[PDB]
């Protein structure tokens, strides 16, 4: 069951159609989320990074998204880690080019609008003013449809309707201002609440070296999923920049961490999760790290409970 993602893709959907047709009401076997996550985690280790989800994986992930979505509508669930692992990998699969394929799919009416991993992601920073610019350049969409594609995408990505986006995390009880949260990153034993306000009861604070869109962003870790009695008072700790770094890393450093990459004028643009060796080598060796930009910054969210900024390579 846990090693479900190591089967053939023909027998991956057939073992996930048998789960939904054989366990229709939630709660009787909540261990099916171990199978729905391991299909996602085995489709993320072999996906070309930041590319739109193609039509073969989008059918496989839509089958095993209903078994997760039957369990977010409840209140108490056994699967806490496996449920939050589906959210972080869906955040890593919802990049700036991924939403560019969904807003095409809702405009033309094709099968790209039935399912996308952005509907279950923990990206709270998506607003109307950003999604009007994330439309694809090649599909020349008229302005009457791209206003209806953003309105339809923002309706499925609602924050309060049918409790589908949040409130099941243990770290969601910490934050007081729920309107100013940008993104939540649930790593193992640490859950980073990336917000735009200091009123987040956590373990420490990290104010970024530059500004975000309007006000500067704060990264508050919640170590071992436990709030504090109050918000952290005093100065916010600085993000230590890393100037010297090696690109050809033979061992498995970085695997477990996160490598969120935001932009000052355009907002946050790409969150990635470093699950194993094949994802780490596909970050360092490709053209992802581009330091000739002016407003793009790369943050490394360690699972130790600290943040680092990548600012140089040999």
């Amino acid at each position, epitope marked *: 069951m846990e090693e479900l993602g190591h089967l053939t893709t023909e027998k991956q959907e057939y073992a996930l159609r048998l789960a939904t047709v054989g366990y229709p009401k939630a709660g009787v076997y909540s261990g099916l989320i171990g199978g729905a996550t391991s299909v996602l985690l085995s489709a993320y280790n072999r996906h070309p990074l*930041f590319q739109p989800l193609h039509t073969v994986m989008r059918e496989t992930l839509f089958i095993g998204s209903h078994v997760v979505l039957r369990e977010l509508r409840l209140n108490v669930t056994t699967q806490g880690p496996n449920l939050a692992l589906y959210q972080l990998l869906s955040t890593a699969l919802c*990049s*700036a080019l991924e939403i560019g394929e969904v807003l095409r799919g809702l405009a033309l009416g094709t099968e790209s609008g039935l399912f996308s991993p952005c509907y279950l992601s923990l990206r709270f920073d998506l607003t109307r003013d950003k999604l009007l610019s994330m439309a694809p*350049q090649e599909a020349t969409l008229d302005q009457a449809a791209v206003s209806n594609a953003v309105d339809g995408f923002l309706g499925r990505l609602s924050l309060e309707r049918e409790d589908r986006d949040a409130w099941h995390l243990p770290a969601y009880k910490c934050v007081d201002r729920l309107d100013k949260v940008l993104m939540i990153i649930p790593l193992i034993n640490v859950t980073f609440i990336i917000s735009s306000d200091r009123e987040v009861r956590g373990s420490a604070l990290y104010e970024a070296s530059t500004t975000y*869109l309007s006000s500067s962003l704060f990264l508050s870790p919640v170590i071992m999923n436990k709030c504090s009695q109050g918000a952290v008072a005093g100065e916010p700790r600085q993000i230590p920049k890393i100037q010297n770094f090696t690109r050809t890393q033979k061992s498995c450093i970085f695997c477990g961490f996160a490598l969120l990459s935001y932009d*000052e004028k355009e907002g946050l*643009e790409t969150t990635t999760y470093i699950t194993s060796q094949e994802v780490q080598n596909s970050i360092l060796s490709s053209n992802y790290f*581009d330091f000739d930009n002016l407003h793009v910054h790369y943050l490394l969210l360690t699972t130790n409970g600290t943040v680092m900024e990548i600012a140089g390579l040999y």
Partner: antibody
Amino acid sequence: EVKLLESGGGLVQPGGSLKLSCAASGFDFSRYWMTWVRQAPGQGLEWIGEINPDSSTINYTPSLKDKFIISRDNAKNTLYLQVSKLRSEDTALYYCARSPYYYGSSYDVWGAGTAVTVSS
Amino acid sequence: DIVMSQSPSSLAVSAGEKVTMNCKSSQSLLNSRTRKNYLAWYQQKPGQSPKLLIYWASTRESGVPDRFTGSGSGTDFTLTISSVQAEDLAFYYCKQSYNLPTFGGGTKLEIK
């Protein structure tokens, strides 16, 4: 409307300083990256620098150390540019251009222009 | 140190013919993780402040007419005016927002 408007041009002696100003209305002068762009007499446009909303980061064109000092004041709804050590080639106009967020770091609204001249 | 080029300098039109102008960069202006192609095309009428026509090399700003269909990606970029008229005699500058911004040379449209 928006109507960015500068003031503080004229004829300046060479080898000094000047504090040009900007003035905005009709929109929120805070939460906006404002820039400065100068022309030349009948030549192509040149970029000078920019400043974020809370005055935390300031970029510049490749130049000397303190040739340009950009500093905004959100209470007066003004934006100041201070050109120091005026050479004989700084005669220009000076545009106060606002750069919005989800644009391609381009300049939406441009001001009028203030003729700076440096000579005898 | 991104330096922009433009050709030709003095492009003369007649009232109605389709014309183009190239803005060939020196370095690639392509954001690798969102595919945005940082660029902006500006028009300066003689005796006015510039105007913003295109940004991100294809997305035309609102209020600009439908005759300014500019595109191109990676290093070379073009701007294609569909049917020019006497209300378009102006310079045309291309900017880049990848590095510290650098305007282009400038092409002007002289009616014959």
